[PDB]
Structure formats: C-alpha cells, structure tokens
Design a protein around this ligand. Structure first.
Ligand SMILES: Cn1c(=O)c2c(ncn2C)n(C)c1=O
Lengths: 120, 117
C-alpha cells in the first residue's frame, strides 16, 4: 500500500467521559486529499462520521457526532485526531480512520481500527 | 448554488431491482463527486457509494458493493443508483448528495426518495 494508516487512542471509559483518537499516515502522504473517521459497532455496517481536508483543514460532520466530536489534523506530523467528548454507551464501536487520494473518490486507504468501549 | 432532485423507488418486491436517479441543476460545473446515502427508520444517514463527476470512478461501501451500481451521465447532469439483489434491510429513504470541488463532506443534499422492499 502506498499509504499506511495506524489508529490509536481507544480504550474503555464510563459514560460522560472523553477519548482522543489519533491516526498517523505514512508513505505517499502528499497524495492525501482528505481523511475521515468511521465506526463499526458489532454486527452493524461501517458508519461515516466526519472528514477533514488535508491541505485546508476544512471539516464536515454527520449529525450523529456533530457538537460532541471534533476532527482535526497536524499536517506536519502526518496525524489526524478525533476528540470524543460526552461519550455514551451507544458510541461503543471499532473506530477506523481512512484517507482519500487526490483525484480519487471514496475511501482508498483504511487503518485496522481502534476499539472504543463506553460502559454505563 | 446547486439543487438536487431524486426520482425512482417506491414499492418493490424483494429480490428485485430498482433504479434511482438524481438530477443536479445550477452550478453543476463545480461538482467534484456525487454520493448516495440512506436512512432507515429512526437511524442515522448511512453513506453508500460515490462517483467522480469528471472521471466516473466509483467507490462502494461493503454494505452494498457487488449489489448496487452507481453511475452518472454528465451531459444530462444525472446520477444513477441501480439497486439489484434488494433485501428487506435495504428499506430506507435514499438521499443523493453532491460535493463541490475543493470542499469536503456533503455540500448539497436532495430531499430523499423512499424505497420499500
Ligand atoms: C472534493 N474533492 C475534490 O475537490 C478533489 C479531490 N481530489 C481532487 N480534488 C479537486 N477529492 C478527493 C475530493 O473529494
């Protein structure tokens, strides 16, 4: 793979708590147009959550996470973040980061995910 | 600056097929890609598939890959979602979107069309 992604930052918290996910990209990172976070709860489909423009830092959020989660990136460190506040049990899932290449569409590169568990 | 109107859908028998379409009007030259989402009752909007407006390159989520086909006719300003091998859990309101060049996410949304399997 010309770009490799590794997510970290997951773990177990109680409801009301916070986590900060991160994902480092390596390889041909100059080809990245945007990065996005998804999550997959057990037995469910992958759900798109939020995206950030790699060059611009412009962001877009789905209503499921808007106003609790913040996506950002430190371009010089080739790292994207997902700040997750006011976590609820229903946020429990494997969280994946992805990259979309310039002149492509969709989600070209995927990490292996990081587990997020929110208990009562 | 861009308006989207979806057509197609309605009641369809399981195992069958439906083709949805969406026509864009306005500043269509600014469109980089278009994408279909769906929302089952009481659930979140789920991203399904996208097509590059200039190139026709496509991407599908695993939920629909190998069953739905997305395509576009640039001259007619129209994008299509061919839905084959439909299953009960495909019942949802289907929404088409457009993303402007140099934007991110989903800038323009249609009003949706119901598909009931
Ligand atoms: C919206 N958009 C663009 O506008 C774009 C792009 N790659 C190049 N451009 C211009 N990608 C991947 C993209 O999603």
């Amino acid at each position: 793979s010309q770009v490799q992604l590794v997510e970290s930052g997951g773990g177990l918290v109680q409801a009301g708590g916070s986590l900060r996910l991160s994902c480092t990209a390596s390889g041909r990172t100059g080809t990245i147009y945007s990065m996005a976070w998804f999550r997959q709860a057990p037995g469910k489909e992958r759900e798109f959550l939020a995206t950030v423009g790699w060059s611009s830092g412009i962001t877009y959020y789905m209503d499921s996470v808007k106003g609790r989660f913040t996506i950002s990136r430190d371009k010089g460190k080739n790292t994207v973040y997902l700040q997750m506040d006011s976590l609820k049990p229903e946020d429990t899932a494997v969280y994946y980061c992805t990259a979309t290449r310039a002149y492509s569409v969709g989600y070209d590169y995927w990490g292996q995910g990081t587990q997020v568990t929110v208990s009562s």
